[PDB]
Amino acid sequence: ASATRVIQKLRNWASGQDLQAKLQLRYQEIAKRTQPPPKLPVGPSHKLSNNYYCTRDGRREVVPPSIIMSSQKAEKKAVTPAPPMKRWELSKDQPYL
Template sequence: MPPRPKIQHHDVSPFLQNLREILLGRKHTKALRFQDLLSTRDPPPPVLPDGPAHRLNNNYYFTRDPRREVTPPEVIVPSPKQIQERGEGRTLITPGKLWNWD
């Protein structure tokens, strides 16, 4: 198959091209799309590492659903009731009501 000839793209005369570039202050990019300037439609497939759910056996939906792995937050600072039960004298001020998950 012989090589494809270079196709002239639709544009204005060279004098007007130079004038346009001077007035714009940069090289003009055409808004039209030409076939020889586009990338191919068949890019190579990506090479991705295997994830936690790449195997087909023992891969049930409920075990790979990340939303089901969310748990209530862990309590780092004890609540004021727990401090009073221990017998400590001061109480902590909390901004609003505590949310009970259960």
């Protein structure tokens, strides 16, 4: 930022870019190292009612896997694991470099 205008023009011509507009070194635009104290918000479970843990106990909703067929327990169309992948559209922003 402390460069002379002749050196700035030489750098700009030699690089082909405006180097002074986007400087690599941070001078004053950064935030202050001393910040005001925060106040973090609370989540949805921070309520005094209608908040029984058994109504939001996601860890106990896990069940053992369902056995489709087993060697001891156990005209239709051929199927696939999923519907086939749709083709990606070419980007309308910048399709080629």
